Design an enzyme around this catalytic site. Structure first.
Site, PDB file in Angstrom:
ATOM      1  N   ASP A  38     149.166 117.554 162.916  1.00 55.93           N
ATOM      2  CA  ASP A  38     148.034 116.621 162.883  1.00 55.93           C
ATOM      3  C   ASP A  38     148.399 115.178 163.218  1.00 55.93           C
ATOM      4  O   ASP A  38     149.380 114.634 162.695  1.00 55.93           O
ATOM      5  CB  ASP A  38     147.310 116.662 161.539  1.00 55.93           C
ATOM      6  CG  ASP A  38     145.860 116.239 161.655  1.00 55.93           C
ATOM      7  OD1 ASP A  38     145.565 115.083 162.015  1.00 55.93           O
ATOM      8  OD2 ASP A  38     145.004 117.091 161.382  1.00 55.93           O
ATOM      9  N   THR A  76     140.025 115.141 162.968  1.00 55.33           N
ATOM     10  CA  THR A  76     140.645 116.474 162.753  1.00 55.33           C
ATOM     11  C   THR A  76     139.732 117.674 163.001  1.00 55.33           C
ATOM     12  O   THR A  76     139.999 118.505 163.875  1.00 55.33           O
ATOM     13  CB  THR A  76     141.118 116.668 161.302  1.00 55.33           C
ATOM     14  OG1 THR A  76     141.754 115.492 160.831  1.00 55.33           O
ATOM     15  CG2 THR A  76     142.068 117.841 161.182  1.00 55.33           C
ATOM     16  N   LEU A 103     134.785 118.121 153.298  1.00 51.85           N
ATOM     17  CA  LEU A 103     135.952 118.995 153.158  1.00 51.85           C
ATOM     18  C   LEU A 103     136.199 119.265 151.672  1.00 51.85           C
ATOM     19  O   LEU A 103     136.623 120.365 151.290  1.00 51.85           O
ATOM     20  CB  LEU A 103     137.184 118.365 153.813  1.00 51.85           C
ATOM     21  CG  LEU A 103     137.009 117.670 155.172  1.00 51.85           C
ATOM     22  CD1 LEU A 103     138.274 116.920 155.569  1.00 51.85           C
ATOM     23  CD2 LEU A 103     136.580 118.642 156.264  1.00 51.85           C
ATOM     24  N   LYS A 131     131.709 123.329 152.486  1.00 47.93           N
ATOM     25  CA  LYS A 131     132.889 123.448 153.359  1.00 47.93           C
ATOM     26  C   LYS A 131     133.123 124.869 153.865  1.00 47.93           C
ATOM     27  O   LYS A 131     133.687 125.056 154.942  1.00 47.93           O
ATOM     28  CB  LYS A 131     134.140 122.914 152.642  1.00 47.93           C
ATOM     29  CG  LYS A 131     135.387 122.754 153.505  1.00 47.93           C
ATOM     30  CD  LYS A 131     136.368 123.887 153.244  1.00 47.93           C
ATOM     31  CE  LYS A 131     137.339 124.094 154.394  1.00 47.93           C
ATOM     32  NZ  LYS A 131     136.826 124.969 155.494  1.00 47.93           N
ATOM     33  N   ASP A 140     150.052 112.795 160.621  1.00 45.74           N
ATOM     34  CA  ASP A 140     148.767 112.170 160.287  1.00 45.74           C
ATOM     35  C   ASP A 140     148.735 111.460 158.924  1.00 45.74           C
ATOM     36  O   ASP A 140     148.124 110.398 158.812  1.00 45.74           O
ATOM     37  CB  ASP A 140     147.635 113.188 160.387  1.00 45.74           C
ATOM     38  CG  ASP A 140     146.286 112.599 160.066  1.00 45.74           C
ATOM     39  OD1 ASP A 140     145.761 111.831 160.891  1.00 45.74           O
ATOM     40  OD2 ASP A 140     145.748 112.901 158.980  1.00 45.74           O
ATOM     41  N   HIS A 171     148.179 107.444 158.721  1.00 47.07           N
ATOM     42  CA  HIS A 171     147.149 106.755 157.952  1.00 47.07           C
ATOM     43  C   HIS A 171     147.749 105.755 156.954  1.00 47.07           C
ATOM     44  O   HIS A 171     147.431 104.563 156.993  1.00 47.07           O
ATOM     45  CB  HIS A 171     146.262 107.768 157.229  1.00 47.07           C
ATOM     46  CG  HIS A 171     145.358 108.548 158.134  1.00 47.07           C
ATOM     47  ND1 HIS A 171     144.101 108.110 158.484  1.00 47.07           N
ATOM     48  CD2 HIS A 171     145.512 109.753 158.729  1.00 47.07           C
ATOM     49  CE1 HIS A 171     143.524 109.005 159.269  1.00 47.07           C
ATOM     50  NE2 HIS A 171     144.361 110.012 159.433  1.00 47.07           N
ATOM     51  N   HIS A 181     141.914 106.913 163.319  1.00 51.60           N
ATOM     52  CA  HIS A 181     141.548 107.568 164.571  1.00 51.60           C
ATOM     53  C   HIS A 181     140.067 107.901 164.475  1.00 51.60           C
ATOM     54  O   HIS A 181     139.448 107.715 163.424  1.00 51.60           O
ATOM     55  CB  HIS A 181     142.369 108.846 164.780  1.00 51.60           C
ATOM     56  CG  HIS A 181     142.358 109.763 163.597  1.00 51.60           C
ATOM     57  ND1 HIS A 181     141.357 110.687 163.379  1.00 51.60           N
ATOM     58  CD2 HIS A 181     143.205 109.872 162.546  1.00 51.60           C
ATOM     59  CE1 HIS A 181     141.597 111.336 162.254  1.00 51.60           C
ATOM     60  NE2 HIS A 181     142.714 110.863 161.729  1.00 51.60           N
TER      61      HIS A 181
HETATM   62  C1  LIG Z   1     139.858 125.574 156.805  1.00 55.44           C
HETATM   63  O1  LIG Z   1     140.128 124.793 155.630  1.00 55.44           O
HETATM   64  C2  LIG Z   1     140.752 123.625 155.941  1.00 55.44           C
HETATM   65  C3  LIG Z   1     141.594 123.688 157.027  1.00 55.44           C
HETATM   66  C4  LIG Z   1     142.252 122.551 157.412  1.00 55.44           C
HETATM   67  N1  LIG Z   1     143.075 122.612 158.459  1.00 55.44           N
HETATM   68  C5  LIG Z   1     143.711 121.516 158.854  1.00 55.44           C
HETATM   69  N2  LIG Z   1     143.609 120.317 158.256  1.00 55.44           N
HETATM   70  C6  LIG Z   1     142.826 120.109 157.183  1.00 55.44           C
HETATM   71  N3  LIG Z   1     142.737 118.842 156.585  1.00 55.44           N
HETATM   72  C7  LIG Z   1     141.489 118.107 156.634  1.00 55.44           C
HETATM   73  C8  LIG Z   1     141.789 116.872 157.479  1.00 55.44           C
HETATM   74  C9  LIG Z   1     142.959 116.047 156.949  1.00 55.44           C
HETATM   75  C10 LIG Z   1     143.348 115.023 158.010  1.00 55.44           C
HETATM   76  C11 LIG Z   1     142.482 113.766 157.947  1.00 55.44           C
HETATM   77  P1  LIG Z   1     141.857 113.267 159.584  1.00 55.44           P
HETATM   78  O2  LIG Z   1     140.503 113.907 159.788  1.00 55.44           O
HETATM   79  O3  LIG Z   1     142.833 113.673 160.731  1.00 55.44           O
HETATM   80  O4  LIG Z   1     141.498 111.792 159.505  1.00 55.44           O
HETATM   81  C12 LIG Z   1     144.182 116.915 156.653  1.00 55.44           C
HETATM   82  C13 LIG Z   1     143.875 118.228 155.914  1.00 55.44           C
HETATM   83  C14 LIG Z   1     142.066 121.275 156.686  1.00 55.44           C
HETATM   84  C15 LIG Z   1     141.221 121.199 155.593  1.00 55.44           C
HETATM   85  C16 LIG Z   1     140.550 122.349 155.196  1.00 55.44           C
HETATM   86  O5  LIG Z   1     139.718 122.293 154.114  1.00 55.44           O
HETATM   87  C17 LIG Z   1     139.729 121.111 153.307  1.00 55.44           C
HETATM   88 ZN   LIG Z   2     143.598 114.972 162.326  1.00 54.74          ZN
HETATM   89 ZN   LIG Z   3     143.849 111.812 160.339  1.00 57.99          ZN
END
Ligand SMILES: COc1cc2ncnc(N3CCC(CCP(=O)(O)O)CC3)c2cc1OC
Ligand SMILES: [Zn+2]
Ligand SMILES: [Zn+2]
Ligand SMILES: *[C@@H]1O[C@H](CO)[C@@H](O[C@@H]2O[C@H](CO)[C@@H](O[C@@H]3O[C@H](CO)[C@@H](O)[C@H](O[C@H]4O[C@H](CO)[C@@H](O)[C@H](O)[C@@H]4O)[C@@H]3O)[C@H](O)[C@H]2NC(C)=O)[C@H](O)[C@H]1NC(C)=O
Ligand SMILES: *[C@@H]1O[C@H](CO)[C@@H](O)[C@H](O)[C@H]1NC(C)=O
Ligand SMILES: *[C@@H]1O[C@H](CO)[C@@H](O)[C@H](O)[C@H]1NC(C)=O
Ligand SMILES: [Ca+2]
Ligand SMILES: [Cl-]
Length: 679
Positions: free
Chosen positions: A31, A69, A103, A108, A189, A193, A343
């Protein structure tokens, strides 16, 4: 000796052990790995560098708007724009459902949100086993399909564990083993941040990320698979440095009120609090006018959904709040109160650009390819798993150049329009203003004429000496006009006797505008388009000051231009139905946009009539009746913003360019999906 320690081995044929009928494909995600991170710190990241060098790499992979994301990972795996796949942002609201989306929410996991068809659903529908380790939408009942192995998102699971567990499922028996895998890491990521994109923290994050990829690679080695797995190292979006001194607060322009909810960050959107009671009631238009041109250098810009740059593809979904804000690099926006890495910005900004590397038997060794949208990846993933892809926004086959043995041999879209010629018919009238062929045709359309994909629209080709016009007999107006403007070249009109005499043709009778400029017949009725006065400033500067400047730079340019009618703001050509329903009152049909495709050669010594390789740029220009959008300098600045892929143009016009071109269909597709990167 570890995998990172060795030189580059070629993988002409998959060297798989018995129990493996074909290579399995892994879609490893890291990420917020800004494409730039590799451009600089590659020398600190040996593993990714070896992957880059023995694999198929690209300097920039263009993510989707908005550069968050959830929309991007789900775009990766559906080959769809966020506007079409549903997941518009990590935080969104659907007025039709009356539901919110976090999320950190029960919603979700609700299957109503996630539209389209992810790769694993696509694999399942075609008897191919699929095992995820965290992926946005993987733990969700999409079409009633889960992956054959999955993990519900628990963010605190050690990284080294996620690498091991995937390495375990490859050990699984040939009957219950997945053929398609996904990994996910939160880095870089998190550090992106917390400490900003330039920090000893992200360097640390990157070097963990590096070493963990090394682990998987060493694990694949210690499973007899280093010459058998097809790896794709990828990322959702990049990372920009945070502001405080560069953050827009709408309290300054509205008072610190609490009646509109405003999504924060660079992807800023606005809606009423009284929702869904007042959602479609709200007059957004006036709030935009209340907010445009309010500063000396206003670093933000209001944008009603349809009037955003179409290249972004962010309007069709009802989850998209009818009032958005385009922002300038680094700048964010809220309603009321900043120094964090962030971002979500324009997908054409340099720092929003994402990582893509392809390693393994399918991919080439040490090939740098050009930049592509991540929506192309889905079709590449379908090819690698022998799947027939779902309908998607990728141009299927444009990534064939990544592959050693590509599967899909694409062919141009067949012409569906009706193309009878226009002889001298309407003999013979005047408008009262105060006033061989093959050699000529080839010159006007050096790359071949556009092909009318409009089923089954009645179009006339009209030959002039300087330009070829494609006139619509189902709309009594031109669709396109092509001319070659070589490096060295006022209230009057003439009746074209080949087109029906519609009353809008006389000077006596929002104005007219020329598709092909006269300053090079161009004053034929078949060359005029309905055009606003505030657009004529853009248009007459474009062809006088701007276009002639390019002709010298490029050593000639070939131009195709025309109207665009996209009233329902999907970014595709409108059915005749909604064309009737949007023709304002004479009963004029009035263009939402004007397209312009500029075609040069890469070899400056060659002129457009004699190019070996093509150079292309295109523009979907918005036909607003006032220049509130933009408030010399400002007209070019509007053009650069309202750039588009040639594919974007084809989609919106139902035309198809370059079908008669030396280049293969796959090469042209890649050409036509080009957008250039800002800064
Ligand atoms: C399918 O269930 C999930 C899958 C995910 N896969 C990848 N990343 C996830 N995240 C949510 C976004 C978070 C990054 C923040 P940003 O949107 O890149 O600003 C990091 C953790 C997930 C979060 C999830 O549920 C909270
Ligand atoms: Zn991301
Ligand atoms: Zn991010
Ligand atoms: C990105 O690719 C996607 C995937 O193909 C594409 O979105 C798709 O567009 C079509 C057309 O807009 C959608 O099909 C519609 O389905 C709904 C019902 O679910 C209908 O209301 C629509 O009916 C109209 O069209 C019919 C025939 O085409 C007419 O007979 C009828 O009278 C209606 O006018 C229509 O069938 C499809 O569901 C979407 N899919 C997704 C996942 O959104 C999109 O166009 C591509 N984006 C770009 C920018 O090109
Ligand atoms: C919509 O949902 C919200 C939050 O659950 C609730 O307050 C409201 O009563 C619902 N309103 C309508 C009009 O359906
Ligand atoms: C997440 O995984 C880790 C490691 O297995 C474990 O210690 C933790 O309790 C898990 N949390 C949840 C909510 O399952
Ligand atoms: Ca349309
Ligand atoms: Cl290159």
């Amino acid at each position: 000796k570890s995998w990172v320690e060795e030189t580059c081995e070629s993988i002409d044929t998959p060297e798989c052990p018995a129990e493996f009928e074909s290579p399995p494909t892994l879609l490893f995600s890291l990420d917020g790995f800004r494409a730039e991170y590799l451009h600089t710190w590659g020398g600190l990241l040996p593993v990714i560098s070896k992957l880059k060098n023995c694999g198929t790499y690209t300097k920039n992979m263009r993510p989707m708007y908005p550069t968050k994301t959830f929309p991007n990972h789900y775009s990766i795996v559906t080959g769809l724009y966020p506007e079409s796949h549903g997941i518009i942002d990590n935080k969104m609201y659907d007025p039709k459902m009356n539901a919110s989306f976090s999320l950190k929410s029960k919603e979700k996991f609700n299957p109503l949100w996630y539209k389209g068809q992810p790769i694993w659903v696509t694999a399942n529908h075609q008897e191919v086993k699929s095992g995820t380790y965290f992926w946005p939408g993987s733990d969700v009942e999409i079409d009633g399909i889960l992956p054959d192995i999955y993990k519900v998102y628990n963010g605190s699971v050690p990284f080294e564990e996620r690498i091991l567990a995937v390495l375990e499922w490859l050990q699984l028996p040939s009957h219950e083993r997945p053929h398609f895998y996904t990994l996910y890491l939160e880095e870089p990521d998190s550090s992106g941040h917390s400490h900003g994109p330039v920090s000893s923290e992200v360097i640390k994050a990157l070097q963990k990320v590096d070493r963990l990829v090394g682990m998987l690679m060493d694990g694949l080695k210690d499973l007899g698979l280093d010459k058998c797995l097809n790896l794709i190292l990828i990322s959702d979006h990049g990372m920009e440095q945070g502001s405080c001194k560069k953050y827009v607060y709408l309290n300054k322009y509205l008072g610190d009120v609490n009646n509109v909810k405003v999504v924060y960050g660079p992807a800023a959107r606005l809606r009423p609090t009284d929702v869904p009671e007042t959602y479609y009631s709200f007059n957004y238009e006036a709030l935009a006018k209340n907010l445009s041109c309010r500063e000396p250098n206003q670093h933000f810009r209001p944008y009603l959904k349809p009037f955003l740059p179409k290249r972004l593809h962010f309007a069709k979904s009802d989850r998209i709040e009818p009032l958005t804000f385009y922002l300038d690099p680094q700048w964010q926006l809220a309603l009321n109160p900043c120094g964090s890495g962030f971002h979500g910005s324009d997908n054409l900004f340099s720092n929003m650009q994402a990582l893509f590397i392809g390693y393994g038997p399918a991919f080439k060794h040490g090939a740098e390819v050009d930049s592509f949208e991540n929506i192309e990846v889905y079709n590449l993933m379908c090819d690698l798993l022998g799947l027939i892809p779902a309908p998607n926004n990728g141009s299927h086959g444009s990534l064939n150049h990544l592959l050693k043995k590509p599967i899909y041999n694409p062919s141009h879209p067949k012409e569906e329009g009706f193309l009878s010629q226009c002889p001298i018919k309407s003999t013979s009238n005047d408008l009262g203003c105060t006033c061989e062929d093959d050699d000529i045709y080839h010159m006007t359309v050096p790359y071949g004429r556009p092909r009318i994909l409009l089923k089954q629209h009645r179009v006339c080709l009209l030959q002039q000496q300087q330009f070829l016009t494609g006139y619509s007999l189902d709309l009594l107006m031109p669709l396109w006009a092509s001319y070659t403007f070589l490096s060295n070249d006022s209230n009057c009109l003439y009746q074209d006797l080949r087109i029906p005499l519609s009353p809008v043709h006389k000077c006596s009778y929002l104005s007219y505008g020329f598709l092909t400029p006269p300053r090079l017949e161009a004053l034929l009725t078949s060359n005029i388009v309905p055009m606003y006065q505030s657009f004529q400033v853009i248009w007459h500067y474009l062809h006088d000051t701007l276009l002639q400047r390019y002709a010298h730079e490029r050593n000639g340019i070939n131009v195709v231009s025309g109207p665009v009618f996209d009233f329902d703001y999907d970014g595709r050509y409108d059915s005749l139905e909604i064309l009737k329903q949007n023709s304002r009152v004479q009963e004029i049909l009035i263009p939402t946009h004007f397209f312009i495709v500029l075609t040069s050669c890469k070899q400056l010594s060659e002129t457009p009539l004699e190019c070996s390789a093509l150079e292309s740029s295109a523009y979907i220009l918005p036909h607003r009746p006032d220049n509130i959008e933009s408030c010399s300098s400002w007209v070019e600045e509007l053009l650069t913003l309202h750039r588009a892929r040639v594919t974007d143009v084809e989609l919106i016009t139902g035309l198809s360019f370059y079908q008669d071109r030396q280049e293969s269909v796959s090469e042209l597709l890649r050409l036509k999906t080009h957008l250039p990167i800002f800064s």
